[PDB]
Each structure stands twice: as structure tokens, then as C-alpha cells.
Design a binder for this molecule. Structure first.
Ligand code: HEM
Ligand code: HEM
Ligand SMILES: Cc1cc(N)nc(COC[C@H](N)[C@H](C)OCc2cc(C)cc(N)n2)c1
Ligand SMILES: Cc1cc(N)nc(COC[C@H](N)[C@H](C)OCc2cc(C)cc(N)n2)c1
Ligand SMILES: C[C@H](O)[C@H](O)[C@H]1CNc2nc(N)[nH]c(=O)c2N1
Ligand SMILES: C[C@H](O)[C@H](O)[C@H]1CNc2nc(N)[nH]c(=O)c2N1
Ligand SMILES: [Zn+2]
Lengths: 407, 411
């Protein structure tokens, strides 16, 4: 019931008690572990509200106070009357920060308390959503000195008037199937791109076309908007040693901004809550560039490097991977766009974990996601046992809206 | 129930039914996943169902399920248990059981090979000296002058828990480690405690960086005894790099034979506490873990120095650069000396083909992602992108506590 986690490099053991608060289910049972699986009414609402307000009033050292009791009373009144309730600004901010704090797959959580929260609950139309999003993009980008931010649109009501950003990230590149059989651009976004074209977007048909936003307000049919090009900061990728690297014509965007998740706070559901931070280099250099189903550039790079690609055991893939990732970091650093390398980020996370164990009694962490996709065991997180469990407030995956939307 | 796993690179989806046969626990619950936790005397009463479950699996595999031979064997085992409180496996059952414990080993990326395993039956062994002779023979057979062959040697099963056979070494071949008065370590820091035990027992330590440890062997619950493996049976590879001529001057070498000796083999409820088993290395085990863990030989700094990489900031990825070079060197050296080794690309590609085959013929393949994904270059191997289900099947290999923590010293 009280659980130990050990670091096998340092022998440090920490004791987790925070897990006993976990509410949601993991996918695992006593018979089967699903650790590597990617996707494993009134009566319901008051308990969820109470749990949340209890933790909130606890956090501000006012647990059991009249203000605590009065707010439970007020929210109770309101749920009974209106079947939902509204968060105070202070609660919305607390909840958003804690959703990030509780994100077990996020290595960047040392930063969790420094989150700029933009309250967009007064938003009513898609044009308004576009405005809020441009402002978030500009604020978070901050000319390359990136700042964490979330923009929170109105909460789900009866579920037929959902706000959604159809895009998976605020900034992403289009994907196009070719008569050729190949894929131009990002193969991850082929389907979403078709949706955009079918809804009107005139596609430039290039390798790095920033997609338009497809915004849904109040359960209405989603509409298209182009982010002002001048607010989308991009970085050309070059290498400090290989002058030929620039000729690959690679670039990436500076701002990672997840826009397809659902924020749950005290039982309320915010289906449009785009949030952004800054990149860890491997996300671009290892995954975006080298996944076989992504830009898949390993073969081209290795060739320009004159490596022996005859046998897997020459480690030509590994050599070219390291170089691509040196180039990503160097390109961002040279242009003064915030980025973190996987060594620095993971070292940060271990310090954050220790703070959380010391101050909170634990930290939910998914080792499968936290360990970087290259050089795993030379980062400290590889050797750190982690317990994964689900705490609320939380970010949750939700189905793509085009499967849900009645047009 | 059917469970699906998806490959996120290929979109190939597999359906697992094998998990229905899982009995042992995982450590996980609906409320907590313990997937990254390293570590998450039987009654007659508990033993017969375990024996029956095993014999049913065995007789099905030979297409004799429910035959007179199957029924007579159940009968024979049942009477043996009620009368002696235990039972003996037939040689065929022992072979089948040892192979299946490997097939079932969810942390093992090398399982495409599971059906090719030489089983050495050492259940007539009675003394530590006897155990030494069996282990030498295993080493020589498995080594095969560099053309490595998988093998397991199986010593007598547990009886009352007071007469256990144990190999105290964690691997048959491993290098000594010595803590110095100034707090530095000579040799392998992983083996300091065991080295101190060997010394205490009377081993004369060479006190160098790659001293092969003696065997410490316990027969029949007696105090363990020291033996030196004949040096001519211990095949080693000096490590050099194909392009960097200074790499040899780091003085590195490693042994060719990875042989785990501290695990417990469970077959049909019987417990084989000494069951050393060996295969061949995947290069990253040596190049990444043994050489580059901070807690092991920790050579990253020296290598990067000699490569003249920019070491003033981690973001030059100097560690990653040195890491790849070291792993090239390991593969190169083993290949050059004709000692079997596999790279992490080949091994993971073979594991995926193995796993798909297992899904088709067997209904599943329990696999532990945390262990199967190599410790470098994870996502450029296909296993990174493969969803896996981890569950426990028997026969199995299990962790057991180090014997110095439990042994009753006779004196
Ligand atoms: C400030 C810098 C940040 C860094 C360096 C960072 C790092 C990361 C990384 C590397 C991932 C894995 C992404 C992947 O492989 O797809 C991740 C996942 C995630 N992070 Fe962050 N993070 C940051 C900020 C944030 C912020 C501001 C939030 C929310 C307010 C957040 C919530 C999440 C969530 C929910 C996931 C899991 C996403 C999913 O399941 O797809 N992170 N983080
Ligand atoms: C034939 C070549 C083989 C290869 C390339 C191979 C590969 C591996 C590797 C890389 C590991 C993880 C090692 C670590 O990080 O500590 C491993 C684990 C394991 N393999 Fe193998 N394997 C082979 C043969 C065998 C054999 C012959 C057996 C038993 C009969 C076996 C049973 C296991 C077990 C039980 C584990 C988990 C060990 C633990 O928990 O410490 N494997 N395999
Ligand atoms: C906020 C933030 C900062 C940072 N450095 N990196 C990120 C990474 O965002 C990318 C997303 N996690 C990607 C697109 O999600 C992958 C994914 C796929 C699926 C099927 C489910 C799921 N939960 N997640 C987000
Ligand atoms: C037979 C074989 C072949 C091959 N290529 N590799 C292996 C694995 O050898 C390494 C061992 N697993 C290492 C020493 O065990 C580490 C370990 C430590 C702890 C505390 C628990 C545990 N289960 N395992 C075994
Ligand atoms: C099947 C497996 O869960 C899947 O490939 C995961 C593994 N770890 C990951 N880790 C991160 N950070 N991001 C990912 O997309 C994935 N993919
Ligand atoms: C804490 C974590 O489970 C531990 O470091 C694991 C991770 N994965 C591993 N994978 C393999 N193959 N071998 C290991 O020793 C480990 N160590
Ligand atoms: Zn689990």
C-alpha cells in the first residue's frame, strides 16, 4: 500500500504514497500489464467537484475553513440547480497547472507551476477562437524565448455544443499522397490535410506547408483560418560540421502546442485547451525526422555521410541519428529559439521527481514515454523506477472530431 | 477474451488469446502500473495442480493429449507426490520445460532461438566439485571456439529448501571489482560485494581491471566452495575500433559467453535453484550497459576525450557520439575474432518476426517493452513502435534472492 521506487544507478529509494489518491484506471490488471499500449450527469459530478475543491482549499492552507465550506455549498447549490458549475479563476488556474503536474508522460514537469493560463471561457465563435489562438501563439513564442501557456475554451455542456480544435497541434505540416505512390510532407497528417482541402483550404502542395486551423465553436461545423505566417516561427536545420546538411532543405517549427486533448478539472471537461511549451531536441531529430512513418530521412543523411550502409552492424543508422540530433539542437540554439537536449531534460526530471516525492509523496511517471527515444541508458531516467497512475486534474486523449462530428 | 496490440509504424494489429493461460501476478493493478519496477517449500496441495497443468501442456505439445500415456503419467506423478511429497521429471519433460521457460521469458529479445537449446541434465550431481565439472563442460560446449551455442545445465531441484543447489555467481563469467581506500573502484563496480565474498572464502585476487571471478558453488545446502574456471576455457575479445587506432590502448576486453547463473527455473511446480543458462551477446549489453553505465566501467569521458568532442555542454551530444563509436568497436571486435554477437538492429528485427509468428501459432508472446527496447537508439528499432502485452506464463525463469543473504553457514 506504501510503495518503494529505486534508482538502480544511485541506490536512492523513494516512498510513494500519492498513488493512494489515484482515481482513474490504468489498463493493467494483476494478470496483465498494458504499460506499452498507447491508448489503454448530476450524481457523478458533485463527488468530482468535492474532491477537487478539497484539494484546492488544502493547497491554499484553508482546508475546513468557512470559505472552503461555503464554496462546496455554492457549487452544490449550482450543480443541483444548473446540472453543471463554473470554476473561479483561481480554481481554473490551479486545475490547469495540476493537470500538467499530473501528466505522467511529460518529462518537462519541473516547469509545471510556471504556466500562463489564458481564460477563453467567454469565447462564443470560431473567429474568436482564432483570435485567442493567435494571441497564445504570439505570447508563447515571444520571439524565440518560449513561455509555457494554455488557452482554455468553454467547458462541455450537453456535449452537442463542444468546442474543439480539429488540429492535433496548433502548428504542423501538411501531408499529401502522390500519384507517385510516395508521400509529400508529413505522412502523419495526410488524413487531416484531406479534411482541410475538402473543407476549402487551397493547399500549396509543398513539403512543409503549415496547416490551417480547423476550429469548432459551440458544436458548430468547424471553420478554416490561416495562422498569420509571421506568427509561426520556424528554424532552418543546419549542422555545425557538415556544410552539406542545409541542402537537405529541412526546417521545423519552434512551438510545440498540443491542441487535441481534453482537460478535466473537478469533473468539468474542457474539450479545447491548446497548450504549449518548448521542444526537447529528440522529438524533432529522432521522431519527426527519423521514424519510418514520418519524414524518414535516415537513408538520405547516411548517404551524404558516406557511411557503409551494407550491414546493420556498422551502426550507420545510429551514426546518422546522432548527427541529425546535433543539427536540430545547433539550429535552434543558433537562432535563439528555446530547446532542451535529452540529457538536460531528463536530469531536470529526476530533480523534479525528488522534489515531488519530498513535497507531495510521489510523482506519477510513465517510463515508456519519459525515457528518450535515443541513448536511453545514458540518461538518468532509464535507471529510475517509476510508478504510473492517474490523478485528476488531467489531460486525456479524446477521439478525433471528424469521427464524432455530425455535419 | 481477445486483446489487441498495434504496431504504430506499420499499423499491423495482433490479437492475443495466450494471456488467458497466465496465472502468476504482474505487480500491476487497475490503479497502478509497475511496468518499470525491476522486482515487482511447497505443499502437496499446491503441487498437483501445477504438475497437472504442466503435463497437460506437455502432452498437448506432443499431440498425445488425453492418451493412455498422458493419463498414466498423471497417475504416476500423483502417486509420487502423495507418497514422497514431490516428483521427478522425465528427461523429455525437463527438456520441454527448459525450452518453454525461455520461450516464456518476456524480457528476452533473443527468443526466436528458443527451440535450439542444448539441455544438460545435471540432476545426478551431488557435490560442489561435481557442479564445477558440469559447469566447465557447459562453458566449453557453449563456447565452441567462438561459434556460440545456447545451453542450460540443470542441477537437482529444491527439496525442503534446506538442501538447495546454488551458483553464487550472478553469471558464470564476470570480472572482479575492488573498492579502493580512496573510494574509487578497480574493475567492475557491479561485482564488488561478490568479489569481497570470494576473497573472504580464500580467493587470491590478482587485483586488476578484468580478473575473471572464481566460481562459488553450493551443493545440497552445504557451504559453497571456490573453483577457478580453467583460463583456456574462458574466451575473451580485446576491443578495438575499425577506424580509431587509439581505441585498443584503452585496454578494454570482454568475455564472449553471457551465462546467467542466479535465476530459478520453475517447471510443473518444481524449483531448480541452480540452472545456469547461456546464449550470445547483443552488442549493446557490453557497449552501452557494461561499458557506459555510470555505475559500471563508465568509459564515456575517456572515449569522448580521445575523440576530441566538445565536452563543455551536453547539447553537443558528445556522450551520444562516443556511445555509438564504442558500440561499433564491440561489434567489430567480436566479428573480427569470429565470436558470435548480434547487433541491436538485427536482434529487434528478428524479435518482431518471432513475435508475429508466436501470435499466429501460439495466440501470443508475452513481452516486457521496458526490457526489449535496446538502451541506445530505441526508436530506430522496430520494437520501440510495437505494443506488447506483459504477463507471466509457466514454465518460467524467476529472480531469487542472493544466497549470501539467506544461507545458513555450517562452518
Ligand atoms: C516547457 C517545456 C516542456 C517540455 C520540454 C515537455 C516535454 C515533453 C515531452 C518530450 C513529451 C513527450 C511528447 C511525445 O513523445 O509525443 C511530453 C508529453 C506531454 N507533456 Fe510535456 N513538456 C513541456 C511542457 C508541457 C506543458 C506546458 C504541458 C501542459 C500544460 C505538457 C503536458 C504534456 C502532456 C499531457 C504530455 C503527453 C502528451 C500525449 O499523451 O501525447 N507539457 N512533454
Ligand atoms: C541466444 C542468444 C540470446 C540473446 C541475444 C538474448 C538477448 C537477451 C538480452 C539482451 C537480454 C536482456 C539482458 C539484460 O539487459 O540484462 C535477455 C534477457 C533474458 N534472456 Fe535472453 N538472449 C539469448 C538467449 C537466452 C537463453 C539461452 C535464455 C535461457 C534459456 C535466455 C533467457 C533470458 C532471460 C530469463 C532474460 C531476463 C534476465 C533477467 O531478468 O535478468 N535468453 N536476453
Ligand atoms: C506541450 C508539449 C511540449 C513538448 N516539448 N512536446 C510536446 C509533444 O507533443 C506531441 C504529441 N504528444 C503527439 C502528437 O502525440 C502523440 C500521441 C498519439 C496518440 C495516438 C495518443 C496520444 N496520447 N499521443 C508537447
Ligand atoms: C543468456 C543470456 C544471453 C544474453 N545475451 N544476455 C543475457 C542477460 O545477461 C545479463 C543479466 N540479465 C543481468 C546481469 O541481470 C541484471 C538483473 C538485475 C536485477 C537486480 C534483477 C534482474 N532480473 N536482472 C543472458
Ligand atoms: C508502443 C509504444 O508504447 C509506443 O511506440 C510509444 C513508446 N514510447 C513513446 N514515448 C514518447 N515520449 N512518445 C511516443 O510517442 C512513444 N511511443
Ligand atoms: C528502472 C528500470 O526498470 C531499469 O533501469 C531497467 C530498464 N530496462 C532494462 N532493460 C534491459 N534489457 N536491462 C536492464 O537492466 C534494464 N533496466
Ligand atoms: Zn502495468
Amino acid at each position: 500500500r506504501f510503495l518503494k521506487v529505486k534508482n538502480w544507478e544511485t541506490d536512492v529509494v523513494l516512498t510513494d504514497t500519492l498513488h493512494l489518491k489515484s482515481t482513474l484506471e490504468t489498463g493493467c490488471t494483476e494478470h496483465i500489464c498494458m504499460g506499452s499500449i498507447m491508448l489503454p450527469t448530476k450524481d457523478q459530478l458533485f463527488p468530482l467537484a468535492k474532491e477537487f475543491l478539497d484539494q484546492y482549499y488544502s493547497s491554499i492552507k484553508r482546508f475546513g475553513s468557512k470559505a472552503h465550506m461555503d464554496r462546496l455549498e455554492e457549487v452544490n447549490k449550482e450543480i443541483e440547480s444548473t446540472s453543471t458549475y463554473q470554476l473561479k479563476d483561481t480554481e481554473l488556474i490551479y486545475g490547469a497547472k495540476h493537470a500538467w503536474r499530473n501528466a505522467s508522460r511529460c518529462v518537462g514537469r519541473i516547469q509545471w507551476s510556471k504556466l500562463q493560463v489564458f481564460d477563453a471561457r467567454d469565447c462564443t465563435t470560431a473567429h474568436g477562437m482564432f483570435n485567442y489562438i493567435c494571441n497564445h501563439v504570439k505570447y508563447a513564442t515571444n520571439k524565440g524565448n518560449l513561455r509555457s501557456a494554455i488557452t482554455i475554451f468553454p467547458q462541455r455542456t450537453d456535449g452537442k455544443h463542444d468546442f474543439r480544435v480539429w488540429n492535433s497541434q496548433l502548428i504542423r505540416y501538411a501531408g499529401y499522397k502522390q500519384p507517385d505512390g510516395s508521400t509529400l510532407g508529413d505522412p502523419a497528417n495526410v488524413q487531416f490535410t484531406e479534411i482541410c482541402i475538402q473543407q476549402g483550404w487551397k493547399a500549396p502542395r509543398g513539403r512543409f506547408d503549415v496547416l490551417p486551423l480547423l476550429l469548432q465553436a459551440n458544436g458548430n461545423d468547424p471553420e478554416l483560418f490561416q495562422i498569420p505566417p509571421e506568427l509561426v516561427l520556424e528554424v532552418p536545420i543546419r549542422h555545425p560540421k557538415f556544410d552539406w546538411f542545409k541542402d537537405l532543405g529541412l526546417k521545423w517549427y519552434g512551438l510545440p502546442a498540443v491542441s487535441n486533448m481534453l482537460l478535466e478539472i473537478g469533473g468539468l471537461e474542457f474539450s479545447a485547451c491548446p497548450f504549449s511549451g518548448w521542444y526537447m531536441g529528440t522529438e524533432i531529430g529522432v521522431r519527426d525526422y527519423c521514424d519510418n512513418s514520418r519524414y524518414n530521412i535516415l537513408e538520405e543523411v547516411a548517404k551524404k555521410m558516406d557511411l557503409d550502409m551494407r550491414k546493420t552492424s556498422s551502426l550507420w543508422k545510429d551514426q546518422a541519428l546522432v548527427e541529425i540530433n546535433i543539427a536540430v539542437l545547433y539550429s535552434f540554439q543558433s537562432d535563439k529559439v528555446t530547446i532542451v537536449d535529452h540529457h538536460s531534460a531528463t536530469e531536470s526530471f529526476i530533480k523534479h521527481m525528488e522534489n515531488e516525492y519530498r513535497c507531495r509523496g510521489g510523482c506519477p511517471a510513465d517510463w515508456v514515454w519519459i525515457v528518450p527515444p535515443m541513448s536511453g541508458s545514458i540518461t538518468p531516467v532509464f535507471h529510475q523506477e517509476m510508478l504510473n497512475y492517474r490523478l485528476t486534474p488531467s489531460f486525456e486523449y479524446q477521439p478525433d472530431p471528424w469521427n464524432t462530428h455530425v455535419w
